[PDB]
Amino acid sequence: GFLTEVGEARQGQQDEVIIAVGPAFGLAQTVNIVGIPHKSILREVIAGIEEEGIKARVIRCFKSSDVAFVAVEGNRLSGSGISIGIQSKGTTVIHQQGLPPLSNLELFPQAPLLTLETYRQIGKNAARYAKRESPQPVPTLNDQMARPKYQAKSAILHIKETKYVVTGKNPQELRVAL
Amino acid sequence: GPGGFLTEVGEARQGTQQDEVIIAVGPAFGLAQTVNIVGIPHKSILREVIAGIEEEGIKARVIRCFKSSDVAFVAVEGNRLSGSGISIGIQSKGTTVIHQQGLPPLSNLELFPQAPLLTLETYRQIGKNAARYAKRESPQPVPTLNDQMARPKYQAKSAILHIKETKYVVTGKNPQELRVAL
Amino acid sequence: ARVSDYPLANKHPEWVKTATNKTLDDFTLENVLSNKVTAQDMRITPETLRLQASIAKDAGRDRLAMNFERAAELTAVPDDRILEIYNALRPYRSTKEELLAIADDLESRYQAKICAAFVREAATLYVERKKLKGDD
Amino acid sequence: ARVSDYPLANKHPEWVKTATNKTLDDFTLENVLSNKVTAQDMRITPETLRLQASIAKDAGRDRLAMNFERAAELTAVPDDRILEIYNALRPYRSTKEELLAIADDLESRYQAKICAAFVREAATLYVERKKLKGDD
Amino acid sequence: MRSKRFEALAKRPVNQDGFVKEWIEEGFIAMESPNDPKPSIKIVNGAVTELDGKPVSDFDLIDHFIARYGINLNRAEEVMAMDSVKLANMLCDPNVKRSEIVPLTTAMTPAKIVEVVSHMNVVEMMMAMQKMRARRTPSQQAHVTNVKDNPVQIAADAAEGAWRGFDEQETTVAVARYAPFNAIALLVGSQVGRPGVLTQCSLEEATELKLGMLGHTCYAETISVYGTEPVFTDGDDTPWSKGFLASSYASRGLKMRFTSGSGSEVQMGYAEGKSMLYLEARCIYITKAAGVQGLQNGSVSCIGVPSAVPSGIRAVLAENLICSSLDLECASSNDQTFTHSDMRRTARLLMQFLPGTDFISSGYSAVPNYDNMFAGSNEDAEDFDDYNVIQRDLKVDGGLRPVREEDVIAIRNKAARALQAVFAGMGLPPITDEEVEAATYAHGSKDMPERNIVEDIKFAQEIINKNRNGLEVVKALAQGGFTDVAQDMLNIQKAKLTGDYLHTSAIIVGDGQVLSAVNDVNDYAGPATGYRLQGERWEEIKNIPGALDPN
Amino acid sequence: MRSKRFEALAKRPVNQDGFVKEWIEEGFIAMESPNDPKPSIKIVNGAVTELDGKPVSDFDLIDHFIARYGINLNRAEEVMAMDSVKLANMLCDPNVKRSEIVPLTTAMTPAKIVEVVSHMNVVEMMMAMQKMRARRTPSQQAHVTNVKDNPVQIAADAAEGAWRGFDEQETTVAVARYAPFNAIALLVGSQVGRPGVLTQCSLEEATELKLGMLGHTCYAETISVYGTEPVFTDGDDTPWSKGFLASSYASRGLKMRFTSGSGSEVQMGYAEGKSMLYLEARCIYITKAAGVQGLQNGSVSCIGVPSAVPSGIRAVLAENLICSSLDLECASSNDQTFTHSDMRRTARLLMQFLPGTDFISSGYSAVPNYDNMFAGSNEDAEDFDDYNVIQRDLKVDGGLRPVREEDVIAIRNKAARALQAVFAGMGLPPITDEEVEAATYAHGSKDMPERNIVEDIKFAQEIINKNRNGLEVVKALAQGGFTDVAQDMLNIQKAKLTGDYLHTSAIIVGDGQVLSAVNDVNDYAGPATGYRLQGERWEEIKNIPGALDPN
């Protein structure tokens, strides 16, 4: 229990990145698909953002469990237009207001490969996008056996995440424990 | 033919003394082929088989067989003539059998059915064991060599070499005793 | 046209004109380099699509021909507008009134009657199945 | 017998006796331990094999039936003589006369008429195809 | 005390795979599910009032689309009354013509055709597929990607793949902004290796259509449809938006197919309690209803879902068979990793390779799988020699051929030089001679110099923002020492004016000859009829490396 | 400069395989050779005067045997007059019954039926094979061997193999004098694993018959026939000596089949310029003519010969199909190594595994291949988990099942203890408790203590020389506390008294019940008919290790 709601998320001011997490993040699931704690994931993403002198603002999204739509509702509220969407199982996207929902600036589509170092670098890159810089994209991680090992598990975790969707409910700003 | 080291010296006669082993080679051995399937020279194979027989206090006699290129039947012609009833059949491609008078032709005492795995050390031990059978011992069999990829690597090559060996069959021709140039 | 008339490129290259009345033989490297033909010239016509729909029907593929008939209507719609209409049909993008306006525009401006009915049909069903703006 | 009579062990066990007129229920563990039955007793009969031949015929397998008929005759030949005759038929083992003597002995001792004819048939063809002793 | 036998088995790659017990409530069951609806149809005044047990008042968008556009209503009641066992018998009977079956299947409901094929084992399904495949000649499609989005490498790998026999090739992006470079490289390299190879760049739907409008692709395939309404919604479409998209591509003279595949609805969280095969049948009928000529299916990217459960690989063949039986071109997957086991992935491939489909694989990886940006294919570049050997062993045309190293080096080198000339002519970040050399001899991106990715993606997005079109590429080739490649690129663009390759199963072979199900109609009628591997094509397949001349 | 792509491919296992270009003059061609004879038959006074273009005056022993005994002359004019394409169509047509085809195929000449099947692709051949297979239920056969002829290990491996589902199991010898021990160990272990499993010991022919006469085997299979006269001669038989041997086995109540297989005549140096498939057809007709009920073929031990040349693996399926079409039980090989490639050997296996044959494999290695004394099988003990996974993937009954480690340990231990009791009871060189433990947990002979081989083969040959028979084994089990195993051994011997298991395709299942083509006739008639994997057998196949419960 390291995430608490502090009310409905409002529009951002321009020196912030929104981390938008899925509806079960830190609740019914507390680790990602390979056991990395959600508390550590957020710790590193926030620290990467703040290392760049940018503010981190965390919200929970409810209208869809899909990480693209989670990130989209984050980028519409973000004062920089930049958001990071994260699912419980760990899939992550850096999104930008004005892009089609299923486009993005960077995508991390194999959650089993992400390390806490990757998550910190994702926050660092998002904050640089918020500053209108052109950072080197986080290097591509690709494992041809990631789906063989984890796709069934990914589907099952996502089925469970999906139970926490609430149609019509706007995002809620979250407080992260110290 | 290059690499010749075997001279036919007349029709092989049946031995009477029990202290010999006949090495019966196929009709192309040392002639159209001078190495076995993995390139071990026929001269070196024969050298080691002979040395293994002789180091057991048994005489080694070499014959060439013509009526069939099949190594069992080559060996059978040898065991008929061997004074000990023990023979070793060797095909050009290297396949080897220790045979004994009275056994069915396609039976044997020991069989070496994957020529690609035989080393010069194996061939010497084959000669030793054959002489020990001639001495009416029951020697420890030569340890089994078996490679599940030997046929994938070499069976087609073995068939081609054997097709070539069979061209040297001569119907009705009795085995010839060989003088070995070693 | 029949199956025996297909493919046009190999059987009847002269049947093929572009939206600007250029022919296949007009598209040479020399004409590209001199800008005698440009990208504006290089676009399939509704007449070509309707000839291919005729071949599709002769091949027993009535639904493919219907697709080609919708495509024939849509050749008159500019690239940017094609993208606008596609996006408006995606979930939660549009109000019902916006979809009906797109349908009216298709019909009255581009005479894309089949496509207009298609969009009106979507509008009605997006109400029932709650895929309009504000339904998420 | 027909295929509806098969398997004999289920449909008609009493049709099966052994060479020494034992029945299937004679072969209990205790009868083996007490030597009440022995290996001599445990041998299929020509009667059983001829029944199975008739079943093979009914199943449309005439050649299988003919094999079973030869086998019926051979039940009467001792193990070591079976081996001698098999070996005599292998290439270059026998003279023509030796095969013909085997045939005549098959008949005189064992009334194995079909098998004797089989051996004489081989002997004739072994002359033509040069598979007799001395032909190698 | 362990059994050493079981310790040996525990180490086997197959025991790293993901297997699950069936989970009916969430759709984790491949086919033949008790929650699946019984086939039915009711029609009143020419309109469907009931579809597979569901009344029209309960129809979702998928039901409406299929009921209004996807079923021939004039024979639907007659065909619904037919015995599904007899229909399955007709499917694999060599003496029931393909043209006798299509009027029946196009009158079936989704549950009905699923009931038909579920009576079949995989041998019967393969026997039927070789008949129902629309194009007489089988073909093959490759992936051309790498983890750096390196365009020089994409051009070289694409030339090699075209030279090995692939008639379609597909790229996609690690970083979405790279896409125009990936697409242009794929198109240039493909035309160098064999003029006529069709190319696609798989992206978000609006992005991919715009890239095609600018002329940097030949077709689109990953035009996705889905078998439940909430999954379709998270896919950011409806049947009406995807049907409009389909006609939009055709209105630009661009070939396209849809993509579906068993297990997507489980993976995306809403299977509505239905089996994978039933939901996939809904996707196949959406494709038919939209008037789309073809479909990529056979689980595709969700293959870890049906493969986890019983009869999942059989279900994958079944969904390919439904596709072809409904007279759609079938690009039959075999494009995505699901197992650590070579034995297991070969069994999965053979279901389509043995009978032949329009594209036996819809994405054989023409790069080593570490570079495959679809997260790995069921076959990759290190399998090329095995694939050719199995073609020769079985006398099966799998669409590929043995090739000579010297020829591949020369064609990769020409493709890299051609792309270098394009980048120079278009004022794009330079391709150096070192990069050309590296791309010539590379196995994958491990063998490539690092590029400035930040600069590349800036210039790549400028291609979009400034609407730089395909004729700029033709001009750059024509003015940079490659008038031959320029002509081949112009010829590929000219194929978009005729509508020919919009038809079912269309590819472009030989001297610009369009080959589709229209002029290469499958006429299978049993042994010694229909497509047979023979003639010069069989000589090509026999000539594998290492065959010693024994005489 | 080398391409790194080609450097990677050159290291692939498949490029260690032996491939050759066709050599027609020496028969190094799998099928469809220009030198193969055209079909013909002339019949005068009820006797054949010409067979496939050869006059009776040119007949060799094989022609004479086939012409006199191997062709159903009662339908010969009708089938010779029928078009071979139509006949091939009938083979794979699901609605032409097996019972309608057999009178015609058995009336074909060897060249005729070769011509028929050569019109077919492998999909058509599989479609036909699922119908022409004589027994409705498919089965499976395993090898049980090791490089030491270690009898304790043979008994344990045999028990495990029987437990996994094999209905026949086969041993052979590194040292021929060991054979009685190998055979007894195999028989005891098989009956411990599943009472009714049939066992054979493959030897020189006169040796193997004598061993069966003494009661230490259940059947014989490697009763070899050959397709040219000079090769048959170096095989030390004629058609008449092998026909006499066949009847000799039946006269002792012993089930037997012949063995043949494409490529033997090339391997043994005399193909008479004919294709492998034509010579193999001659072997199949020799088997038919002898009245032998079944045949092991599909190249078998000579698989490196057809696999080297084009269409060799297709020819292997063709020769299996010819066997079943001639109404012979087909034990369809998949028992011998031909490739370093897992992909390649899986493709070769699926040809028989997918439709099913009487024995899908006639020698799956139930030991790791290093211990396989047939020089390696196409599958071995380390493939057991893959084999079960593919059964589940495809819903195909491959004859085997998942098993629990604890059950296998217990059954291997009981087998080892039972053989220990046999050896003590019969006064054979002791099996120590250490050896019993070792055999219980072994993967292969690397895990076994060394035995005194010289002492073992002394006592093994005394079993032959003193005619120690199977009832001694029964007695030793009964006196050593294995009354149950003794009873099961006695029941196997009783099966030699009834003749029931001499019939086509017979195995012994359940509680001593014979299951053959006579009482389990294949009745295939298309989808949803004939053998189907379902019910409890399907539940067994689904229950693979590692299938997690998702919720």
Ligand code: B12
């Ligand atoms: C499986 C897969 C899918 C599946 C499942 C998607 C889902 N939401 O469940 C299907 C086929 C349905 C699909 C669809 C799309 N995909 Co996709 N997909 C993959 C693939 C091949 C493998 C991922 C995987 O199995 N990872 C292993 C598991 C264990 O890790 P995971 O973190 O749990 O994986 C999840 C993510 O990959 C996520 N995901 C998959 N695709 C996409 C796309 C986007 C934009 C996002 C945000 C997330 C996402 O779904 C997986 C399961 O939840 C990757 C290729 C790759 N390089 O990874 C492409 C890939 C990620 N997809 C991509 C694209 C373009 C799409 C689409 C936008 C295409 C379209 N026609 O609309 C859609 C997006 C739909 C959606 N709502 O997400 C591109 C992304 C390019 C980029 N740099 O932005 C990739 C790289 C390649 C491709 N062209 O398919 N995809």
Ligand code: B12
């Ligand atoms: C291929 C093979 C055959 C082939 C080819 C034989 C030939 N002459 O061409 C076929 C199937 C025809 C065959 C038949 C027989 N074989 Co074999 N055969 C094998 C096998 C499976 C593989 C050998 C191989 O490929 N080696 C790789 C190649 C590259 O090396 P190679 O030296 O060139 O191989 C040659 C020898 O193996 C030789 N050969 C094969 N079998 C036999 C048997 C005998 C007695 C002899 C002398 C030689 C011989 O033929 C091969 C090709 O030239 C071995 C198993 C093993 N453990 O090796 C059994 C094996 C050697 N054969 C065996 C037997 C029993 C026989 C037969 C007597 C069976 C019978 N029913 O009559 C016959 C003998 C026929 C003959 N004239 O040789 C036993 C020997 C047991 C023993 N310790 O004595 C083995 C161990 C196992 C078995 N049961 O099959 N065999």
Ligand SMILES: C[C@H]1O[C@@H](n2cnc3c(N)ncnc32)[C@H](O)[C@@H]1O
């Ligand atoms: C690889 C591309 O193919 C499409 N794709 C792949 N697999 C499926 C499936 N099962 N369902 C729908 N679309 C799919 C997606 O568009 C993805 O991005």
Ligand SMILES: C[C@H]1O[C@@H](n2cnc3c(N)ncnc32)[C@H](O)[C@@H]1O
């Ligand atoms: C393994 C055993 O099976 C028999 N065997 C194996 N392959 C063949 C073949 N192609 N032809 C004839 N007999 C064969 C031999 O008897 C061998 O010893």
Ligand SMILES: [Ca+2]
């Ligand atoms: Ca694809």
Ligand SMILES: [Ca+2]
């Ligand atoms: Ca066998």
Ligand SMILES: [Cl-]
């Ligand atoms: Cl239609």
Ligand SMILES: [Cl-]
């Ligand atoms: Cl018959």
Ligand SMILES: [Cl-]
């Ligand atoms: Cl289950």
Ligand SMILES: [Cl-]
């Ligand atoms: Cl089935």
Ligand SMILES: [Cl-]
């Ligand atoms: Cl060739």
Ligand SMILES: [Cl-]
């Ligand atoms: Cl064919």
Ligand SMILES: [K+]
């Ligand atoms: K797309």
Ligand SMILES: [K+]
């Ligand atoms: K689907």
Ligand SMILES: [K+]
């Ligand atoms: K034998």
Ligand SMILES: [K+]
């Ligand atoms: K043969």
